[PDB]
C-alpha cells in the first residue's frame, strides 16, 4: 500500500457508486475506512456488506487528477440494480497504468483513422475488447488486424469523455502506414492531467 487497488471498470446507473461520483476508468479504490486494499481478498465486499445502509469512507486515486480523494458511499440493497455499490472492479496497479495509452497525432484525410473518426491530438486510445498479452501493445493490435475491424475505447481531452471507435487497418489504403495517422507514446503523450 503501495500501488495496488481496485480499478473501477464501470458503474451502473442510479448506483451508490454513481451517486458518489466514482469515475469509471480513471478511479482506483485504494482504501475503505482504515483498511488499505492492497491485496485481492474479500475485505472490500465484506466491509460494504457489514455497513450496508450506512455511510462508509473510501479513498480513491484518480489518473486524470493524479490525486487521492476521500469519497463517502452508502452501500445499499435498495437501489434496484446489482451489488451494494453498483460498481464493476478489478484488482490492479495504478503505478504505471496511465502510461498505457496511445495519443492520436495528425490524421490524414481518407485514411483508416479518418474513416473511424479519430480526432487529431485530442484522442487517446485507452483500451480495446482485445486483451494484450505481456509485451504486446497498441501496435501489436494494429499489426494483427490488417483488413479487420478493431474495436477501441478512446478518451477525448477536449470533450472529456470516452467513446467506442472501430478502425480497420489497411496497409493498401494508398497513403503511408496502415492507419494514416501519427501515434505518440511516452511522456507528452498521456491523458492530460486536470487541475480539479
Amino acid at each position: 500500500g503501495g500501488a495496488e487497488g481496485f480499478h473501477l471498470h464501470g458503474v451502473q446507473e442510479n448506483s451508490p457508486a454513481q451517486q458518489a461520483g466514482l469515475e469509471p476508468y480513471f478511479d482506483f479504490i485504494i482504501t475503505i475506512g482504515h483498511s488499505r486494499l492492497n491485496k485481492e481478498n474479500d475485505t472490500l465486499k465484506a466491509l460494504l456488506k457489514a455497513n450496508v445502509e450506512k455511510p462508509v469512507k473510501l479513498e480513491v486515486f484518480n489518473m486524470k487528477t493524479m490525486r487521492v480523494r476521500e469519497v463517502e458511499v452508502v452501500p445499499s440493497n435498495m437501489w434496484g440494480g446489482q451489488g451494494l455499490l453498483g460498481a464493476s472492479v478489478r484488482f490492479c496497479s495504478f503505478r504505471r497504468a496511465s502510461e498505457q495509452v496511445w495519443h492520436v497525432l495528425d490524421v490524414e484525410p481518407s485514411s483508416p483513422a479518418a474513416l473511424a473518426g479519430l480526432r487529431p491530438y485530442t484522442d487517446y486510445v485507452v483500451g480495446s475488447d482485445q486483451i494484450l498479452q505481456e509485451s504486446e501493445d497498441f501496435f501489436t493490435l494494429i499489426e494483427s488486424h490488417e483488413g479487420k475491424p478493431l474495436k477501441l475505447m478512446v478518451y477525448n481531452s477536449k470533450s472529456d469523455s470516452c467513446r467506442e471507435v472501430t478502425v480497420t487497418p489497411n496497409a493498401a489504403w494508398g497513403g503511408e502506414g496502415s492507419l494514416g495517422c501519427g501515434i505518440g507514446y511516452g511522456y507528452l503523450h498521456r491523458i492530460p492531467t486536470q487541475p480539479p
Binding site: 480499478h7 471498470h9 464501470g10 490492479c92 497498441f138
Partner: peptide, 22 residues
Amino acid sequence: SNPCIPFFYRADENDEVKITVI
C-alpha cells in the same frame, strides 16, 4: 456483447479477465 478492457489489464492465471460486481 464483449467488454472494453483497458490496455493496462492483464489476463489471470487462467487467461481470463474477471471483472467483479460489488
